[PDB]
Amino acid sequence: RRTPPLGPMPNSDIDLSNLERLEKYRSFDRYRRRAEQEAQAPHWWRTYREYFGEKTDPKEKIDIGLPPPKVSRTQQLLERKQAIQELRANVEEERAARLRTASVPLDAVRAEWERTCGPYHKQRLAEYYGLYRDLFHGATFVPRVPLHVAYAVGEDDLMPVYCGNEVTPTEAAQAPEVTYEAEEGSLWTLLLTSLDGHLLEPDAEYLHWLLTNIPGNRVAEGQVTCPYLPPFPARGSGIHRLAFLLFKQDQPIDFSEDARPSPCYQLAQRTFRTFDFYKKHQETMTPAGLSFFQCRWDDSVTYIFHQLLDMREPVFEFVRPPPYHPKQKRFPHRQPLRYLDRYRDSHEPTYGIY
Amino acid sequence: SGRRQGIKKMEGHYVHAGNIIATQRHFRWHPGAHVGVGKNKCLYALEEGIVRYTKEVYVPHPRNTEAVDLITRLPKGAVLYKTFVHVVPAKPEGTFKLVAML
């Protein structure tokens, strides 16, 4: 009994009549390049991607961000081509490349990277970290506005936040310094949310910081809808995600509903969900910038719980499932003596009735 | 004068870590995700989960002279396939439990 294939079988286009005349791979790399391409393609038969690949909605992710900037490709291509011909013209450039002494300025690369591919690389990083999945329930935006957040550590130093880098709670004790490029007249909302900090509800977040109606880059003049609170990741709970979200308002917005007291040290009042908060204000404000960092417990967190939050510090442990053993049998034929220890609860001798 | 070799655990069966999925004289089923290989080509589960059999593109190790020679002589555009057995982990590594309220 044979069943016809449910589609094109692999290696079927290959004409076997003239095998000698066909072009062979001749190299491991060429075969591997084709092999990876074939693996990515969808197949009717069962594949590893089916069982292990994540199942996500086929419909494309909704884009809720600012529109892409308008670029003239013809002029852009013209200038870039002329720039490379100018660079290659220099004899010193060719000699440095040939002698393998040339290098690239990392600072200049990052400046251009922020303007060009940086928003799309930050979106990829945010997608990999689950920020869109948890903040906007799968909706995605491109952070068009580069958001620069740095924590003043000491007097002369600054700890920057670069979309996932680790910042300790000690360094985040005080509100960070936030800068971004904003034209005159614009209004912005800046919030800091802890995706993984909530101690009671799995899907809820903590509103650590919320500044609204920020005129331009003057973050200090923005209304303090929620005072800044340092991140307090519980000891033994792992690494937590702290995400700064910048919103570009279309007009002045009334945030009285989202207002919180000053100071706000009640975890019930700081319970927050970005999706619900944005959903009510989606008409008036668009997600513009995104920064986030990873935080884990440090000694400074204990101060936050005892002093600021006036509570006992919760401690957690990573607990693994108990080891599996088969159901014990009266006669464990061919099993070692230690078989009986696998089902023994106490190591101390027992005496029964005696 | 015969022996028993073959699939101990069929598709969709639940296996525990260390369970022998299959025994074979030669590689008929290849180790997939979370499937270990023994000295005698025995396939065993490295995690607790469901056994799955799939068809995956075969790419040998660059230092496997015998296998690399085969793929280099293949017509361009032709990809080798083999049957792989996988274990889909059923349980998480662990959970975070509250242990103290200092």
Binding site: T3, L6 | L74
Partner: peptide, 21 residues
């Protein structure tokens, strides 16, 4: 497996020209 539609998905010797030792 023979009965299944995917029978023969991993046959390769037809692709390679046979060589006699």
């Amino acid at each position: 497996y023979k009965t299944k539609p995917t029978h023969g998905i991993g046959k390769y010797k037809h692709l390679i020209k046979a060589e006699e030792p």
